[PDB]
Amino acid sequence: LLKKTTGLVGLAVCETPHERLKILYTKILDVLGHIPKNAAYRKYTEQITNEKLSIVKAEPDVKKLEEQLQGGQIEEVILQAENELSLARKMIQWKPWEPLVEEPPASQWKWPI
Amino acid sequence: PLTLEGIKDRVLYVLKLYDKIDPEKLSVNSHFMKDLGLDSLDQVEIIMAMEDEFGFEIPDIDAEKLMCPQEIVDYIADKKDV
Amino acid sequence: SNLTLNFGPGVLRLVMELSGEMVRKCDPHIGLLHRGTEKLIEYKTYLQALPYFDRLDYVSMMCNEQAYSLAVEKLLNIQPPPRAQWIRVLFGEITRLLNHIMAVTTHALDIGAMTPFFWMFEEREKMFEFYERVSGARMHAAYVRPGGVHQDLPLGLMDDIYEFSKNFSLRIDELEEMLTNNRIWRNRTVDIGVVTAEDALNYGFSGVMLRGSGIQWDLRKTQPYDVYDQVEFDVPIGSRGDCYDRYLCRVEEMRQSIRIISQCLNKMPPGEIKVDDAKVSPPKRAEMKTSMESLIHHFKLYTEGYQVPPGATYTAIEAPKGEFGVYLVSDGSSRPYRCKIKAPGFAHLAGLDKMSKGHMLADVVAIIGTQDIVFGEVDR
Amino acid sequence: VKQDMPPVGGYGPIDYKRNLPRRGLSGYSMF
Amino acid sequence: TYKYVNLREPSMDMKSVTDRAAQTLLWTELIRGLGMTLSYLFREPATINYPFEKGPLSPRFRGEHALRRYPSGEERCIACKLCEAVCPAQAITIEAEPRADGSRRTTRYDIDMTKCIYCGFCQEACPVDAIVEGPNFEFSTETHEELLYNKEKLLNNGDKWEAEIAANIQADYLYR
Amino acid sequence: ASATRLIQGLRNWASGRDLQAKLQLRYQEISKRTQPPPKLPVGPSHRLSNNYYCARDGRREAMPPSIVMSSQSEKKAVSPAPPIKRWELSQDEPYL
Amino acid sequence: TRPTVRPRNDVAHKQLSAFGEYVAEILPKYVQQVQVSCFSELEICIHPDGVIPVLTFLRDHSNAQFKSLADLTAVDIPTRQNRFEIVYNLLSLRFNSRIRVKTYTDELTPVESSVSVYKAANWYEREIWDMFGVFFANHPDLRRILTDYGFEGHPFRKDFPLSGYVELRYDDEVKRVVAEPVELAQEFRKFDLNSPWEAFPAYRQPPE
Amino acid sequence: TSVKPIFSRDMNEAKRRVRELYRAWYREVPNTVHLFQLDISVKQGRDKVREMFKKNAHVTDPRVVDLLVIKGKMELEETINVWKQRTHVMRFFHETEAPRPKDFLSKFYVGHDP
Numbered sequence A: 001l002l003k004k005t006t007g008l009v010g011l012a013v014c015e016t017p018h019e020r021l022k023i024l025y026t027k028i029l030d031v032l033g034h035i036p037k038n039a040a041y042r043k044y045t046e047q048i049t050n051e052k053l054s055i056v057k058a059e060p061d062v063k064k065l066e067e068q069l070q071g072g073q074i075e076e077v078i079l080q081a082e083n084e085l086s087l088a089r090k091m092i093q094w095k096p097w098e099p100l101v102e103e104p105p106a107s108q109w110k111w112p113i
Numbered sequence B: 001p002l003t004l005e006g007i008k009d010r011v012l013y014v015l016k017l018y019d020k021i022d023p024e025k026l027s028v029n030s031h032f033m034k035d036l037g038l039d040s041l042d043q044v045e046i047i048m049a050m051e052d053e054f055g056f057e058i059p060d061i062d063a064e065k066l067m068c069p070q071e072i073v074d075y076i077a078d079k080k081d082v
Numbered sequence C: 001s002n003l004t005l006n007f008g009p010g011v012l013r014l015v016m017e018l019s020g021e022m023v024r025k026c027d028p029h030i031g032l033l034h035r036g037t038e039k040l041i042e043y044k045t046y047l048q049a050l051p052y053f054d055r056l057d058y059v060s061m062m063c064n065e066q067a068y069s070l071a072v073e074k075l076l077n078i079q080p081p082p083r084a085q086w087i088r089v090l091f092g093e094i095t096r097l098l099n100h101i102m103a104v105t106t107h108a109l110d111i112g113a114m115t116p117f118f119w120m121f122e123e124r125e126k127m128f129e130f131y132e133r134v135s136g137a138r139m140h141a142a143y144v145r146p147g148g149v150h151q152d153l154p155l156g157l158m159d160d161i162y163e164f165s166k167n168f169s170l171r172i173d174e175l176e177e178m179l180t181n182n183r184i185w186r187n188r189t190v191d192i193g194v195v196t197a198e199d200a201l202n203y204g205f206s207g208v209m210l211r212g213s214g215i216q217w218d219l220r221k222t223q224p225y226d227v228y229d230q231v232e233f234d235v236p237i238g239s240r241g242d243c244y245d246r247y248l249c250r251v252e253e254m255r256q257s258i259r260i261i262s263q264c265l266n267k268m269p270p271g272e273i274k275v276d277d278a279k280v281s282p283p284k285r286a287e288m289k290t291s292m293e294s295l296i297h298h299f300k301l302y303t304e305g306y307q308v309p310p311g312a313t314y315t316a317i318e319a320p321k322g323e324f325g326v327y328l329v330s331d332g333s334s335r336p337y338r339c340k341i342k343a344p345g346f347a348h349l350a351g352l353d354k355m356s357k358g359h360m361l362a363d364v365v366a367i368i369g370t371q372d373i374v375f376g377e378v379d380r
Numbered sequence D: 001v002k003q004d005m006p007p008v009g010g011y012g013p014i015d016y017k018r019n020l021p022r023r024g025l026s027g028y029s030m031f
Numbered sequence E: 001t002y003k004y005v006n007l008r009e010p011s012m013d014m015k016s017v018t019d020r021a022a023q024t025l026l027w028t029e030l031i032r033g034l035g036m037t038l039s040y041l042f043r044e045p046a047t048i049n050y051p052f053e054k055g056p057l058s059p060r061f062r063g064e065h066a067l068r069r070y071p072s073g074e075e076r077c078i079a080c081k082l083c084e085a086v087c088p089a090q091a092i093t094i095e096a097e098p099r100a101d102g103s104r105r106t107t108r109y110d111i112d113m114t115k116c117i118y119c120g121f122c123q124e125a126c127p128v129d130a131i132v133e134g135p136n137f138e139f140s141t142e143t144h145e146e147l148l149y150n151k152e153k154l155l156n157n158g159d160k161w162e163a164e165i166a167a168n169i170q171a172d173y174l175y176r
Numbered sequence F: 001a002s003a004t005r006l007i008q009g010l011r012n013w014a015s016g017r018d019l020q021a022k023l024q025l026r027y028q029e030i031s032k033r034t035q036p037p038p039k040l041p042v043g044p045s046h047r048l049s050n051n052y053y054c055a056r057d058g059r060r061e062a063m064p065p066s067i068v069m070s071s072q073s074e075k076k077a078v079s080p081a082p083p084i085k086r087w088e089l090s091q092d093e094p095y096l
Numbered sequence G: 001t002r003p004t005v006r007p008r009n010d011v012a013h014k015q016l017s018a019f020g021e022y023v024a025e026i027l028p029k030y031v032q033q034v035q036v037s038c039f040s041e042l043e044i045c046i047h048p049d050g051v052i053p054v055l056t057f058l059r060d061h062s063n064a065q066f067k068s069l070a071d072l073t074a075v076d077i078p079t080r081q082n083r084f085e086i087v088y089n090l091l092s093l094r095f096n097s098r099i100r101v102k103t104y105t106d107e108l109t110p111v112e113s114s115v116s117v118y119k120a121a122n123w124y125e126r127e128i129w130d131m132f133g134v135f136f137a138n139h140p141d142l143r144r145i146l147t148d149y150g151f152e153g154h155p156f157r158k159d160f161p162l163s164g165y166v167e168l169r170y171d172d173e174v175k176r177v178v179a180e181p182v183e184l185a186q187e188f189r190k191f192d193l194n195s196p197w198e199a200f201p202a203y204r205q206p207p208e
Numbered sequence H: 001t002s003v004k005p006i007f008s009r010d011m012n013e014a015k016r017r018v019r020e021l022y023r024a025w026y027r028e029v030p031n032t033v034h035l036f037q038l039d040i041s042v043k044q045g046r047d048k049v050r051e052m053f054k055k056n057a058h059v060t061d062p063r064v065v066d067l068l069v070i071k072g073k074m075e076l077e078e079t080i081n082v083w084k085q086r087t088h089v090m091r092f093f094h095e096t097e098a099p100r101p102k103d104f105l106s107k108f109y110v111g112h113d114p
Ligand SMILES: CCCCCCCCCCCCCCCCCC(=O)OC[C@H](COP(=O)([O-])OCC[N+](C)(C)C)OC(=O)CCCCCCCCCCCCCCCCC
Pocket: C183, D031, E024, E025, E026, E027, E030, E031, E034
């Protein structure tokens, strides 16, 4: 129907939201395959990305895709997919599935003192 | 900057303008810390007076190794042609 | 090279790097009203700490009272009585009218439109009469307290609030006749201070500073407090993120505050106005002078104060300047261990440097107007 | 009990919308 | 539950374009603003004639402090120091002793009116209605130390303003 | 209220509104400065029986925070809450 | 316990506990504690090396989207060897939720600045520099924001006194506002207000 | 005993940063005396800079002298940019403060302070 505005300032209307979400979700899965399988970030993000990708592949309509992705406008769903891709690329470098780097001191989180 | 003798005389002129150094004990090979009895910051403001006179910035790694007027005139000779 | 203007000492110091007419850098120097409020709070009881909140956003007194009261009541695990909650929502929207009159009319006064200032401050004087009739003070009421409110409404106050509210929309209409369609007012606000939605979220903006950019967020709707889920109102949403849509959002919030005030006047319940836990709220003076337990509780609440159970909350309200938060840490004693005050104007004035890039020097006073900045809450 | 309360039927309707009353001639008529 | 301020697309027929061109060239909204300013020119102004006319106040009004008495001349203050305990500014300084008939009475009752935040926590903490924040607001001074009230000043304020303070308390004590 | 009808008509014409119906100056319509005395109600804890304070002690039902994780399968990924419901446009006045 | 007691929200408590488990198992490298208060607020207590990886997670993860930094706070607790407790309050507008991220530092260990995650942090941690003395590494313009320009010390430290060490007055000899050691005409009266009876048995600490 | 550094790995890099901060203050003192139109000399301001550097001369911790260099750079930034007024620059010279009693006997005469 070619939505005129997203309503959010600085968030332009995406012309082809379905193909853009398919590209972003397969790119998230490609980046996310470089994480070990036992990492919870990989399991959880593959789970939610496969759910969103199946919803995108199942719905031709743009408005109904917005109501069942449940993330607002379709352009901020695209923006969140970009943020998840950037996050996964950072999580490869951080490697935060590793064990805890240091225990806190024994009364560090004791409240009240 | 032309001859080494003029650079040495100008180094000694800068050091005799510096009021904490005794001009009677001020020689070319006199050490600042253990002979002339100076603080490190005294040597730092000596090096800044040398930068004022000779017109080039002396970095920190090669100003810490300037502990006598002979080292100063050799450093100014090495950063120029002479 | 480029010009550096030190606009010296609300009160604000500004360090401008200008490149002719354009603004290259805006560095707001603050602390000119830093009074160390939240260090003073650590040496006072919770009741004693309450009147500091009147003096942070000093055009939004009972709203900051409400935010601090909600924080203390959350840590105390008690709730105010329903009539207290309706009085808090009524006076919170009267307070919102006070603050948006102050915001819009001083923002017009700093641009050059000096007359609707004088027109709307008589209405503001009548609302200060409402504060004075309910508490005894025109501005710093110390009225909304942890446990409810201090004192019940005097007889005949709601009729006068009705007589104010019945006429106030015409005052908004003639303000809007002076400014909204005026081409001089539009030339000072329409392309000025454009904030994208993502930058407004990232820079910690709240309130109209989000809603002018099209972000559908209002804490009275999304994270509702006292009885705001029982009142019906709309949330004005901007479309261009500029000074003009934020102006229109504040005008329409005055409209919706009048709507909420009508609903509060019609739905005011009977009953008590303090929580009937006399280990938190002081008993009535007639039973203080008659009952032994009531006299003991009066004594201890006005000397020691109530003990608050240990823990930390972040309690936020939709104040008329945006999200007003208290991060309150209790150690178990009757005095706050820590009270961080989150003010909207702090992050808004931090975003002033991005908002002023590419604009003129006369646009900066408009951007400092559209960010409703009171330096009491900015500096604490 | 006697308390500050609304009246029995409640208060009357309170206007809260924009009323810019659209006065003046048409743009054809003003030229 | 939300509305869009400023999301109107203007009509582009020749009627509305000519309306906007007439507004641009013939300054219509500027004459509207002049009409609104002219309308307030012929209104009665809101100005009261101070000092002959006064701003309206309530009996709850928090003004100048006073120490009160019983209806026998005995002062109400029994030196319990609740008012200085609750005082958020620490504006109240109290010293006490038994006086010559053994009564628990103050020897020092100071209120620094320049520390005081005028919030009235002292009058609501007072168990005997001794300290009140009375109705006077017209007590500006020429010197700072004239606002450092001792017990003699506060008892004279009580004796000065009691005819008004007692009637304001009579109007409001059932709300307290 | 004391304005003559010529000035009143000029004033209503210049504002474009009926100004006498909604005057910003207050008159006899406001409440009396002397009111009858109130009789304020009491709260729910003003009872002579079944009113033990331990059955209504709010501060003593506050608990320390429940430690979910401390350092001394195919479970569903979760969010902190369900996603927020999309706001509906105003039926009252959407400006559409 | 109906009228005077705050009603407990068990649904939000269960949801925030599940999301705290979620965050603790996605990021076990830095998460030290996860707790949910009785008024349903989630606290993630982390190691200070994970300021940037945790906050970037909560900002960018599709099940978190904590896009708003509501507040950034330090708390001085002098009985801890890491006396400063850095507190991040985050708002997710997508999931209508708030989270608290807590970490710690002493006087000398720098905390990594989170301006690359939230630009909102730019002044807040700057305030934490001014009030507490916590240095933030890789901050763009870290300097004082609230105290006077030549102010010595960090005022919101609990060993800093209420009135400071200096006070200002105009001196007419030097024609200048001058700073002198503080003398008070009336000392601030310290009130010992704590009852010697236990108030909350649920918060009783185990004895020695 | 393994702590995280601020800028300096040891005391030599720390002394390098101290030395550069002293160079920058030494260069700035004449401009500070000029543009604040101070009533002190350049020699007196440089003696005050030397006094403030020698006051902290006992510190052997690299993190503490890193924070001292950071705070000295902040004071220098507040001086070069005219953010301080003349009063803030002259607060280093405690001119209106009367000299404290130094020996035992005058402190005995004036009061109770040790
Ligand atoms: C003796 C009395 C003298 C004064 C009389 C007026 C008194 C009252 C004045 C009240 C207002 C005062 C406000 C002060 C600030 C004014 C600002 C302002 O208006 O700026 C000017 C504004 C500026 O408009 P603008 O820039 O805001 O509007 C945007 C315009 N665009 C989109 C193009 C960028 O208007 C003008 O420039 C108009 C100038 C005067 C035109 C007069 C009418 C000419 C009509 C000719 C006939 C046309 C017929 C159709 C065509 C066919 C021709 C054959």
